[PDB]
Amino acid sequence: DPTLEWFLSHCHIHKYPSKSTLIHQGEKAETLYYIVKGSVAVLIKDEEGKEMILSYLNQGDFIGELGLFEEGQERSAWVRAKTACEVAEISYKKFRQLIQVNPDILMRLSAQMARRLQVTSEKVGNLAFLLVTGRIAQTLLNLAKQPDAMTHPDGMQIKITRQEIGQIVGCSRETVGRILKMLEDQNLISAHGKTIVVY
Amino acid sequence: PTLEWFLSHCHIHKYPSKSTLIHQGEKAETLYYIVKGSVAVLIKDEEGKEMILSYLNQGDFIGELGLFEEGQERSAWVRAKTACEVAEISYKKFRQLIQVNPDILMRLSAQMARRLQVTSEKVGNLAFLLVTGRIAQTLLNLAKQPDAMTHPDGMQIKITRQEIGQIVGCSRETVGRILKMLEDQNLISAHGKTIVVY
Numbered sequence A: 001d002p003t004l005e006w007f008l009s010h011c012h013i014h015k016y017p018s019k020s021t022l023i024h025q026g027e028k029a030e031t032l033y034y035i036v037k038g039s040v041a042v043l044i045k046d047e048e049g050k051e052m053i054l055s056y057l058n059q060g061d062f063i064g065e066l067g068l069f070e071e072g073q074e075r076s077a078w079v080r081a082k083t084a085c086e087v088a089e090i091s092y093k094k095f096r097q098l099i100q101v102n103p104d105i106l107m108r109l110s111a112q113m114a115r116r117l118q119v120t121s122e123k124v125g126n127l128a129f130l131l132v133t134g135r136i137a138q139t140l141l142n143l144a145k146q147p148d149a150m151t152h153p154d155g156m157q158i159k160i161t162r163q164e165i166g167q168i169v170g171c172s173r174e175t176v177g178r179i180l181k182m183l184e185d186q187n188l189i190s191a192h193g194k195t196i197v198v199y
Numbered sequence B: 001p002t003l004e005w006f007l008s009h010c011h012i013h014k015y016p017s018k019s020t021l022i023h024q025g026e027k028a029e030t031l032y033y034i035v036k037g038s039v040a041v042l043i044k045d046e047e048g049k050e051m052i053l054s055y056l057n058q059g060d061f062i063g064e065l066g067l068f069e070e071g072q073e074r075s076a077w078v079r080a081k082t083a084c085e086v087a088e089i090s091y092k093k094f095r096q097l098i099q100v101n102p103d104i105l106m107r108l109s110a111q112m113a114r115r116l117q118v119t120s121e122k123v124g125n126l127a128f129l130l131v132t133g134r135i136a137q138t139l140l141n142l143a144k145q146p147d148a149m150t151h152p153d154g155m156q157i158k159i160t161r162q163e164i165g166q167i168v169g170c171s172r173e174t175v176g177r178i179l180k181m182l183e184d185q186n187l188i189s190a191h192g193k194t195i196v197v198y
Protein backbone atom coordinates (compact mmCIF):
# COMPACT_ATOMS: atom_id res chain seq x y z
CA ASP A 1 0.00 0.00 0.00
CA PRO A 2 0.97 3.70 -0.37
CA THR A 3 1.97 4.14 3.28
CA LEU A 4 4.38 1.19 3.26
CA GLU A 5 5.71 2.14 -0.18
CA TRP A 6 6.48 5.61 1.19
CA PHE A 7 8.14 4.17 4.28
CA LEU A 8 10.18 1.71 2.24
CA SER A 9 11.44 4.55 0.00
CA HIS A 10 13.27 5.87 3.06
CA CYS A 11 14.90 2.55 3.90
CA HIS A 12 17.96 0.85 2.52
CA ILE A 13 17.38 -2.76 1.57
CA HIS A 14 19.68 -5.71 2.11
CA LYS A 15 19.69 -9.43 1.41
CA TYR A 16 20.50 -11.99 4.10
CA PRO A 17 21.12 -15.57 3.01
CA SER A 18 19.35 -18.40 4.82
CA LYS A 19 20.69 -19.06 8.34
CA SER A 20 22.40 -15.68 8.66
CA THR A 21 21.82 -13.67 11.83
CA LEU A 22 20.13 -10.30 11.33
CA ILE A 23 20.13 -9.31 14.99
CA HIS A 24 22.28 -10.53 17.85
CA GLN A 25 21.02 -10.34 21.42
CA GLY A 26 22.91 -7.69 23.37
CA GLU A 27 23.75 -5.43 20.40
CA LYS A 28 23.11 -1.70 20.87
CA ALA A 29 19.82 -0.94 19.10
CA GLU A 30 19.68 2.05 16.73
CA THR A 31 18.02 0.48 13.68
CA LEU A 32 14.53 -0.69 12.65
CA TYR A 33 14.05 -3.56 10.15
CA TYR A 34 11.14 -4.62 7.97
CA ILE A 35 10.87 -7.93 6.14
CA VAL A 36 10.27 -7.31 2.42
CA LYS A 37 10.65 -10.99 1.60
CA GLY A 38 11.47 -14.12 3.57
CA SER A 39 10.99 -15.53 7.06
CA VAL A 40 12.94 -15.35 10.31
CA ALA A 41 13.03 -16.95 13.74
CA VAL A 42 13.24 -14.96 16.97
CA LEU A 43 15.28 -16.92 19.53
CA ILE A 44 16.38 -16.68 23.15
CA LYS A 45 18.83 -18.93 25.02
CA ASP A 46 19.44 -20.27 28.50
CA GLU A 47 22.78 -20.50 30.31
CA GLU A 48 23.70 -23.79 28.59
CA GLY A 49 22.91 -22.55 25.08
CA LYS A 50 19.50 -24.22 24.77
CA GLU A 51 17.34 -22.23 22.38
CA MET A 52 13.68 -21.32 22.45
CA ILE A 53 11.86 -19.86 19.47
CA LEU A 54 9.76 -16.93 20.68
CA SER A 55 8.21 -16.28 17.29
CA TYR A 56 8.51 -16.68 13.59
CA LEU A 57 8.22 -13.46 11.63
CA ASN A 58 7.44 -13.11 7.95
CA GLN A 59 7.02 -10.79 5.00
CA GLY A 60 5.41 -7.56 6.19
CA ASP A 61 6.72 -7.81 9.77
CA PHE A 62 8.83 -5.16 11.47
CA ILE A 63 11.84 -6.36 13.49
CA GLY A 64 14.16 -4.64 15.93
CA GLU A 65 11.43 -2.29 17.10
CA LEU A 66 11.84 -2.78 20.84
CA GLY A 67 14.70 -0.28 21.16
CA LEU A 68 12.96 2.56 19.30
CA PHE A 69 11.25 4.23 22.24
CA GLU A 70 14.12 4.74 24.69
CA GLU A 71 17.81 5.36 24.02
CA GLY A 72 20.59 3.02 25.10
CA GLN A 73 18.75 -0.28 24.79
CA GLU A 74 20.14 -3.62 23.72
CA ARG A 75 18.59 -6.15 21.35
CA SER A 76 16.37 -8.51 23.35
CA ALA A 77 16.80 -11.66 21.26
CA TRP A 78 18.55 -13.16 18.26
CA VAL A 79 16.83 -13.03 14.90
CA ARG A 80 17.94 -15.63 12.34
CA ALA A 81 17.02 -15.95 8.67
CA LYS A 82 14.98 -19.14 8.06
CA THR A 83 15.14 -18.55 4.31
CA ALA A 84 16.90 -16.07 2.05
CA CYS A 85 15.56 -12.68 3.16
CA GLU A 86 15.26 -9.20 1.71
CA VAL A 87 15.15 -6.76 4.60
CA ALA A 88 14.62 -3.01 4.70
CA GLU A 89 16.50 -1.00 7.34
CA ILE A 90 16.19 2.53 8.67
CA SER A 91 17.77 4.39 11.57
CA TYR A 92 15.57 5.11 14.58
CA LYS A 93 16.43 8.76 14.07
CA LYS A 94 15.01 8.81 10.49
CA PHE A 95 12.03 6.65 11.45
CA ARG A 96 11.10 9.16 14.15
CA GLN A 97 10.98 11.88 11.50
CA LEU A 98 8.68 9.70 9.38
CA ILE A 99 6.36 9.29 12.38
CA GLN A 100 6.00 13.10 12.59
CA VAL A 101 5.25 13.31 8.89
CA ASN A 102 2.73 10.45 8.98
CA PRO A 103 1.93 8.66 12.24
CA ASP A 104 0.08 5.94 10.29
CA ILE A 105 3.47 4.23 9.98
CA LEU A 106 3.76 4.12 13.78
CA MET A 107 0.22 2.76 13.92
CA ARG A 108 1.31 -0.07 11.61
CA LEU A 109 4.30 -0.90 13.78
CA SER A 110 2.38 -0.60 17.04
CA ALA A 111 -0.34 -2.93 15.71
CA GLN A 112 2.31 -5.62 15.34
CA MET A 113 3.72 -4.91 18.78
CA ALA A 114 0.25 -5.34 20.29
CA ARG A 115 -0.30 -8.64 18.50
CA ARG A 116 3.11 -9.87 19.65
CA LEU A 117 2.32 -9.04 23.27
CA GLN A 118 -0.96 -10.99 22.93
CA VAL A 119 0.74 -14.01 21.37
CA THR A 120 3.67 -14.01 23.76
CA SER A 121 1.32 -13.74 26.71
CA GLU A 122 -0.54 -16.77 25.37
CA LYS A 123 2.78 -18.62 25.22
CA VAL A 124 3.40 -17.78 28.87
CA GLY A 125 0.03 -19.33 29.68
CA ASN A 126 0.82 -22.44 27.63
CA LEU A 127 4.15 -22.93 29.39
CA ALA A 128 2.65 -22.31 32.82
CA PHE A 129 -0.52 -24.34 32.42
CA LEU A 130 0.06 -27.11 29.87
CA LEU A 131 2.24 -30.21 30.00
CA VAL A 132 4.70 -30.97 27.21
CA THR A 133 2.25 -33.29 25.45
CA GLY A 134 -0.39 -30.57 25.39
CA ARG A 135 2.08 -28.00 24.13
CA ILE A 136 3.25 -30.32 21.38
CA ALA A 137 -0.34 -31.17 20.41
CA GLN A 138 -1.29 -27.50 20.21
CA THR A 139 1.86 -26.71 18.22
CA LEU A 140 1.14 -29.43 15.66
CA LEU A 141 -2.44 -28.18 15.32
CA ASN A 142 -1.35 -24.56 14.83
CA LEU A 143 1.24 -25.51 12.20
CA ALA A 144 -1.32 -27.53 10.23
CA LYS A 145 -3.56 -24.45 10.04
CA GLN A 146 -0.72 -22.28 8.72
CA PRO A 147 -0.59 -21.05 5.08
CA ASP A 148 2.36 -23.29 4.22
CA ALA A 149 0.56 -26.48 5.25
CA MET A 150 0.09 -29.22 2.65
CA THR A 151 -3.27 -30.87 2.00
CA HIS A 152 -3.27 -34.59 2.74
CA PRO A 153 -5.88 -37.34 2.35
CA ASP A 154 -5.99 -37.71 6.14
CA GLY A 155 -5.70 -34.06 7.19
CA MET A 156 -2.93 -31.49 6.93
CA GLN A 157 0.72 -32.38 6.31
CA ILE A 158 3.47 -30.28 7.88
CA LYS A 159 7.26 -30.19 7.70
CA ILE A 160 9.14 -29.66 10.95
CA THR A 161 12.04 -31.36 12.72
CA ARG A 162 12.00 -32.71 16.26
CA GLN A 163 14.63 -30.12 17.11
CA GLU A 164 12.40 -27.27 15.96
CA ILE A 165 9.42 -28.64 17.89
CA GLY A 166 11.57 -28.85 20.98
CA GLN A 167 12.64 -25.25 20.50
CA ILE A 168 9.02 -24.13 20.27
CA VAL A 169 7.60 -26.02 23.24
CA GLY A 170 10.70 -26.17 25.44
CA CYS A 171 11.99 -29.73 25.52
CA SER A 172 14.69 -32.04 24.15
CA ARG A 173 14.46 -33.59 20.69
CA GLU A 174 14.38 -36.97 22.44
CA THR A 175 11.31 -35.94 24.44
CA VAL A 176 9.64 -34.73 21.25
CA GLY A 177 10.39 -38.12 19.69
CA ARG A 178 8.73 -39.96 22.57
CA ILE A 179 5.64 -37.74 22.60
CA LEU A 180 5.22 -37.95 18.82
CA LYS A 181 5.28 -41.73 19.04
CA MET A 182 2.62 -41.53 21.71
CA LEU A 183 0.49 -39.30 19.47
CA GLU A 184 0.79 -41.73 16.58
CA ASP A 185 -0.07 -44.61 18.91
CA GLN A 186 -3.28 -42.72 19.70
CA ASN A 187 -4.03 -42.40 15.99
CA LEU A 188 -3.85 -38.59 16.12
CA ILE A 189 -0.98 -38.12 13.69
CA SER A 190 1.47 -40.04 11.55
CA ALA A 191 5.22 -39.39 11.32
CA HIS A 192 6.91 -40.24 8.02
CA GLY A 193 10.35 -38.66 8.29
CA LYS A 194 10.57 -34.89 8.59
CA THR A 195 6.91 -34.93 7.59
CA ILE A 196 3.96 -35.07 9.98
CA VAL A 197 0.30 -35.62 9.10
CA VAL A 198 -2.10 -34.04 11.60
CA TYR A 199 -5.42 -35.87 11.31
CA PRO B 1 2.14 18.82 29.31
CA THR B 2 1.36 16.27 26.62
CA LEU B 3 0.14 14.11 29.53
CA GLU B 4 -1.93 17.05 30.75
CA TRP B 5 -3.34 17.47 27.25
CA PHE B 6 -4.09 13.76 26.91
CA LEU B 7 -5.78 13.64 30.32
CA SER B 8 -8.01 16.60 29.46
CA HIS B 9 -9.64 14.32 26.88
CA CYS B 10 -10.27 11.53 29.40
CA HIS B 11 -12.95 10.66 31.93
CA ILE B 12 -11.35 9.73 35.26
CA HIS B 13 -12.84 7.10 37.57
CA LYS B 14 -11.98 5.54 40.94
CA TYR B 15 -11.58 1.81 41.56
CA PRO B 16 -11.36 0.30 45.03
CA SER B 17 -8.80 -2.37 45.91
CA LYS B 18 -9.55 -5.82 44.47
CA SER B 19 -12.00 -4.44 41.89
CA THR B 20 -11.64 -5.70 38.33
CA LEU B 21 -10.87 -2.96 35.80
CA ILE B 22 -10.92 -5.23 32.75
CA HIS B 23 -12.41 -8.70 32.18
CA GLN B 24 -10.84 -11.13 29.73
CA GLY B 25 -12.99 -11.74 26.67
CA GLU B 26 -14.90 -8.46 26.81
CA LYS B 27 -15.03 -6.45 23.59
CA ALA B 28 -12.17 -3.90 23.59
CA GLU B 29 -13.25 -0.37 22.70
CA THR B 30 -11.58 1.77 25.38
CA LEU B 31 -8.06 2.77 26.51
CA TYR B 32 -7.15 3.32 30.18
CA TYR B 33 -4.36 5.21 31.92
CA ILE B 34 -3.36 4.80 35.58
CA VAL B 35 -3.32 8.21 37.26
CA LYS B 36 -2.92 6.67 40.73
CA GLY B 37 -2.63 3.16 42.11
CA SER B 38 -1.38 -0.25 41.08
CA VAL B 39 -2.94 -3.19 39.28
CA ALA B 40 -2.15 -6.78 38.41
CA VAL B 41 -2.57 -8.24 34.95
CA LEU B 42 -3.71 -11.86 35.23
CA ILE B 43 -4.52 -14.94 33.15
CA LYS B 44 -6.30 -18.13 34.29
CA ASP B 45 -6.15 -21.83 33.48
CA GLU B 46 -8.99 -24.34 33.23
CA GLU B 47 -8.71 -25.01 36.98
CA GLY B 48 -9.06 -21.36 38.03
CA LYS B 49 -5.35 -21.10 38.82
CA GLU B 50 -4.18 -17.54 38.19
CA MET B 51 -0.86 -16.30 36.89
CA ILE B 52 0.31 -12.71 37.16
CA LEU B 53 1.69 -11.47 33.81
CA SER B 54 2.59 -8.06 35.15
CA TYR B 55 2.07 -5.42 37.77
CA LEU B 56 1.33 -1.97 36.32
CA ASN B 57 1.52 1.30 38.20
CA GLN B 58 0.93 5.04 37.98
CA GLY B 59 1.84 6.27 34.50
CA ASP B 60 0.92 2.98 32.83
CA PHE B 61 -1.57 2.60 30.01
CA ILE B 62 -3.94 -0.38 30.25
CA GLY B 63 -6.30 -1.99 27.76
CA GLU B 64 -4.13 -0.84 24.86
CA LEU B 65 -3.98 -4.15 22.97
CA GLY B 66 -7.29 -3.77 21.09
CA LEU B 67 -6.48 -0.23 19.86
CA PHE B 68 -5.09 -1.20 16.46
CA GLU B 69 -7.70 -3.56 15.02
CA GLU B 70 -11.46 -3.60 15.63
CA GLY B 71 -13.44 -6.52 17.02
CA GLN B 72 -10.86 -7.85 19.45
CA GLU B 73 -11.30 -9.19 22.97
CA ARG B 74 -9.59 -8.15 26.18
CA SER B 75 -6.60 -10.47 26.41
CA ALA B 76 -6.37 -10.66 30.20
CA TRP B 77 -7.91 -9.65 33.50
CA VAL B 78 -6.72 -6.41 35.13
CA ARG B 79 -7.41 -6.10 38.83
CA ALA B 80 -6.81 -3.25 41.23
CA LYS B 81 -4.11 -4.03 43.81
CA THR B 82 -4.55 -0.79 45.67
CA ALA B 83 -7.42 1.59 44.97
CA CYS B 84 -6.92 3.22 41.57
CA GLU B 85 -7.75 6.47 39.80
CA VAL B 86 -7.98 5.57 36.12
CA ALA B 87 -8.37 7.81 33.06
CA GLU B 88 -10.54 6.40 30.28
CA ILE B 89 -10.83 7.34 26.57
CA SER B 90 -12.50 5.67 23.58
CA TYR B 91 -10.20 4.10 20.99
CA LYS B 92 -11.81 6.47 18.45
CA LYS B 93 -10.93 9.61 20.40
CA PHE B 94 -7.42 8.37 21.10
CA ARG B 95 -6.80 7.76 17.39
CA GLN B 96 -7.67 11.43 16.77
CA LEU B 97 -5.22 12.55 19.46
CA ILE B 98 -2.43 10.54 17.78
CA GLN B 99 -2.80 12.63 14.59
CA VAL B 100 -2.43 15.81 16.68
CA ASN B 101 0.67 14.65 18.57
CA PRO B 102 2.00 11.10 18.00
CA ASP B 103 4.18 11.40 21.11
CA ILE B 104 1.15 10.09 22.99
CA LEU B 105 1.37 6.94 20.85
CA MET B 106 5.15 6.82 21.34
CA ARG B 107 4.57 6.78 25.11
CA LEU B 108 2.03 3.97 24.83
CA SER B 109 4.19 1.98 22.43
CA ALA B 110 7.22 2.42 24.70
CA GLN B 111 5.24 0.54 27.32
CA MET B 112 4.17 -2.17 24.87
CA ALA B 113 7.85 -2.62 24.01
CA ARG B 114 8.91 -2.95 27.63
CA ARG B 115 6.07 -5.39 28.28
CA LEU B 116 7.09 -7.58 25.35
CA GLN B 117 10.67 -7.63 26.65
CA VAL B 118 9.51 -8.62 30.14
CA THR B 119 6.96 -11.17 28.96
CA SER B 120 9.50 -12.71 26.58
CA GLU B 121 11.89 -13.12 29.51
CA LYS B 122 9.07 -14.83 31.42
CA VAL B 123 8.71 -17.28 28.53
CA GLY B 124 12.38 -18.16 28.83
CA ASN B 125 12.11 -18.52 32.59
CA LEU B 126 9.17 -20.92 32.29
CA ALA B 127 10.86 -22.95 29.58
CA PHE B 128 14.34 -23.14 31.09
CA LEU B 129 14.07 -23.02 34.89
CA LEU B 130 12.68 -25.29 37.57
CA VAL B 131 10.40 -23.94 40.28
CA THR B 132 13.25 -23.02 42.63
CA GLY B 133 15.04 -21.17 39.82
CA ARG B 134 11.88 -19.31 38.86
CA ILE B 135 11.30 -18.22 42.43
CA ALA B 136 14.96 -17.16 42.66
CA GLN B 137 14.75 -15.11 39.47
CA THR B 138 11.48 -13.56 40.65
CA LEU B 139 13.17 -12.39 43.85
CA LEU B 140 16.07 -11.03 41.80
CA ASN B 141 13.66 -9.20 39.50
CA LEU B 142 11.75 -7.65 42.39
CA ALA B 143 15.06 -6.54 43.97
CA LYS B 144 15.75 -4.50 40.82
CA GLN B 145 12.49 -2.54 40.89
CA PRO B 146 12.34 1.13 41.96
CA ASP B 147 10.18 0.22 44.99
CA ALA B 148 12.87 -2.09 46.39
CA MET B 149 14.58 -0.62 49.48
CA THR B 150 18.29 -0.61 50.29
CA HIS B 151 19.22 -2.85 53.21
CA PRO B 152 22.52 -3.69 54.93
CA ASP B 153 22.36 -7.22 53.53
CA GLY B 154 21.00 -6.45 50.06
CA MET B 155 17.69 -5.22 48.70
CA GLN B 156 14.52 -5.53 50.73
CA ILE B 157 11.34 -6.23 48.81
CA LYS B 158 7.70 -6.44 49.78
CA ILE B 159 5.66 -9.38 48.51
CA THR B 160 3.45 -12.21 49.70
CA ARG B 161 3.98 -15.91 49.14
CA GLN B 162 0.69 -16.02 47.25
CA GLU B 163 1.94 -13.29 44.90
CA ILE B 164 5.19 -15.11 44.27
CA GLY B 165 3.15 -18.26 43.55
CA GLN B 166 0.99 -16.38 41.06
CA ILE B 167 4.12 -15.06 39.34
CA VAL B 168 6.10 -18.33 39.02
CA GLY B 169 3.25 -20.80 38.63
CA CYS B 170 3.17 -22.68 41.91
CA SER B 171 1.17 -22.92 45.12
CA ARG B 172 1.64 -20.54 48.03
CA GLU B 173 2.68 -23.54 50.13
CA THR B 174 5.41 -24.43 47.63
CA VAL B 175 6.69 -20.86 47.77
CA GLY B 176 6.79 -21.02 51.56
CA ARG B 177 8.83 -24.21 51.54
CA ILE B 178 11.27 -22.91 48.93
CA LEU B 179 11.86 -19.53 50.60
CA LYS B 180 12.84 -21.42 53.77
CA MET B 181 15.27 -23.49 51.73
CA LEU B 182 16.75 -20.39 50.09
CA GLU B 183 17.31 -18.78 53.46
CA ASP B 184 19.10 -21.92 54.65
CA GLN B 185 21.41 -21.58 51.65
CA ASN B 186 22.24 -18.06 52.85
CA LEU B 187 20.72 -16.33 49.80
CA ILE B 188 17.82 -14.43 51.39
CA SER B 189 16.01 -13.62 54.63
CA ALA B 190 12.29 -13.42 55.44
CA HIS B 191 10.00 -11.72 57.99
CA GLY B 192 6.23 -12.08 57.61
CA LYS B 193 5.73 -10.26 54.31
CA THR B 194 9.19 -8.73 53.91
CA ILE B 195 12.13 -10.39 52.13
CA VAL B 196 15.79 -9.38 51.88
CA VAL B 197 17.57 -10.61 48.76
CA TYR B 198 21.29 -10.84 49.49
Ligand SMILES: Nc1ncnc2c1ncn2[C@@H]1O[C@@H]2COP(=O)(O)O[C@H]2[C@H]1O
Pocket: A023, A029, A042, A054, A055, A062, A063, A064, A065, A066, A067, A074, A075, A076, A077, A078, A079, A116, A120, B116, B120
Ligand atom coordinates in the same frame (compact mmCIF):
# COMPACT_ATOMS: atom_id res chain seq x y z
N1 LIG C 1 8.10 -12.21 21.92
C1 LIG C 1 8.42 -11.74 20.69
N2 LIG C 1 7.63 -11.85 19.61
C2 LIG C 1 7.98 -11.36 18.39
N3 LIG C 1 9.15 -10.73 18.15
C3 LIG C 1 10.02 -10.56 19.18
C4 LIG C 1 9.71 -11.05 20.52
N4 LIG C 1 10.75 -10.74 21.33
C5 LIG C 1 11.65 -10.09 20.54
N5 LIG C 1 11.22 -9.99 19.27
C6 LIG C 1 11.89 -9.34 18.12
O1 LIG C 1 13.30 -9.62 18.21
C7 LIG C 1 13.96 -8.35 18.15
C8 LIG C 1 15.31 -8.34 18.84
O2 LIG C 1 15.74 -6.99 18.70
P1 LIG C 1 14.89 -5.83 19.40
O3 LIG C 1 14.83 -6.11 20.86
O4 LIG C 1 15.39 -4.48 18.96
O5 LIG C 1 13.42 -6.10 18.75
C9 LIG C 1 13.01 -7.44 18.88
C10 LIG C 1 11.70 -7.83 18.22
O6 LIG C 1 11.60 -7.32 16.89
Ligand SMILES: Nc1ncnc2c1ncn2[C@@H]1O[C@@H]2COP(=O)(O)O[C@H]2[C@H]1O
Pocket: A049, A050, A051, A052, A162, A163, A164, A165, A166, A167, A168, A169, A170, A171, A172, A173, A174, B127, B128
Ligand atom coordinates in the same frame (compact mmCIF):
# COMPACT_ATOMS: atom_id res chain seq x y z
N1 LIG D 1 13.74 -27.05 28.84
C1 LIG D 1 14.42 -27.50 27.76
N2 LIG D 1 15.05 -28.70 27.79
C2 LIG D 1 15.73 -29.16 26.73
N3 LIG D 1 15.84 -28.50 25.57
C3 LIG D 1 15.27 -27.29 25.40
C4 LIG D 1 14.50 -26.71 26.51
N4 LIG D 1 14.04 -25.52 26.08
C5 LIG D 1 14.46 -25.35 24.81
N5 LIG D 1 15.21 -26.39 24.42
C6 LIG D 1 15.80 -26.51 23.07
O1 LIG D 1 14.98 -27.33 22.22
C7 LIG D 1 15.87 -28.15 21.46
C8 LIG D 1 15.27 -29.42 20.88
O2 LIG D 1 16.35 -30.07 20.21
P1 LIG D 1 17.71 -30.40 21.02
O3 LIG D 1 17.41 -31.42 22.10
O4 LIG D 1 18.80 -30.83 20.07
O5 LIG D 1 18.07 -28.99 21.72
C9 LIG D 1 16.97 -28.47 22.45
C10 LIG D 1 17.19 -27.14 23.14
O6 LIG D 1 18.08 -26.33 22.37
Ligand SMILES: Nc1ncnc2c1ncn2[C@@H]1O[C@@H]2COP(=O)(O)O[C@H]2[C@H]1O
Pocket: A117, A121, B022, B028, B041, B053, B054, B061, B062, B063, B064, B065, B066, B073, B074, B075, B076, B077, B078, B115, B119
Ligand atom coordinates in the same frame (compact mmCIF):
# COMPACT_ATOMS: atom_id res chain seq x y z
N1 LIG E 1 2.08 -9.54 29.04
C1 LIG E 1 1.53 -8.40 29.50
N2 LIG E 1 2.24 -7.48 30.19
C2 LIG E 1 1.70 -6.34 30.65
N3 LIG E 1 0.41 -6.02 30.43
C3 LIG E 1 -0.42 -6.87 29.77
C4 LIG E 1 0.10 -8.13 29.25
N4 LIG E 1 -0.90 -8.77 28.63
C5 LIG E 1 -2.00 -7.98 28.76
N5 LIG E 1 -1.70 -6.85 29.44
C6 LIG E 1 -2.63 -5.75 29.73
O1 LIG E 1 -3.89 -6.37 30.02
C7 LIG E 1 -4.88 -5.78 29.18
C8 LIG E 1 -6.10 -6.64 28.91
O2 LIG E 1 -6.93 -5.86 28.04
P1 LIG E 1 -6.28 -5.49 26.60
O3 LIG E 1 -6.06 -6.79 25.88
O4 LIG E 1 -7.17 -4.51 25.90
O5 LIG E 1 -4.91 -4.77 27.04
C9 LIG E 1 -4.11 -5.56 27.91
C10 LIG E 1 -2.85 -4.93 28.46
O6 LIG E 1 -3.02 -3.58 28.86
Ligand SMILES: Nc1ncnc2c1ncn2[C@@H]1O[C@@H]2COP(=O)(O)O[C@H]2[C@H]1O
Pocket: A128, B048, B049, B050, B051, B161, B162, B163, B164, B165, B166, B167, B168, B169, B170, B171, B172, B173
Ligand atom coordinates in the same frame (compact mmCIF):
# COMPACT_ATOMS: atom_id res chain seq x y z
N1 LIG F 1 0.99 -25.01 38.67
C1 LIG F 1 0.41 -24.30 39.67
N2 LIG F 1 0.18 -24.86 40.88
C2 LIG F 1 -0.40 -24.18 41.88
N3 LIG F 1 -0.80 -22.90 41.77
C3 LIG F 1 -0.63 -22.22 40.61
C4 LIG F 1 -0.01 -22.89 39.47
N4 LIG F 1 0.03 -22.00 38.47
C5 LIG F 1 -0.52 -20.84 38.93
N5 LIG F 1 -0.93 -20.98 40.21
C6 LIG F 1 -1.56 -19.93 41.04
O1 LIG F 1 -0.58 -19.39 41.95
C7 LIG F 1 -1.27 -19.19 43.18
C8 LIG F 1 -0.38 -19.03 44.40
O2 LIG F 1 -1.26 -18.90 45.51
P1 LIG F 1 -2.39 -20.03 45.77
O3 LIG F 1 -1.74 -21.33 46.19
O4 LIG F 1 -3.42 -19.56 46.78
O5 LIG F 1 -3.09 -20.21 44.32
C9 LIG F 1 -2.16 -20.40 43.26
C10 LIG F 1 -2.72 -20.48 41.86
O6 LIG F 1 -3.85 -19.61 41.71
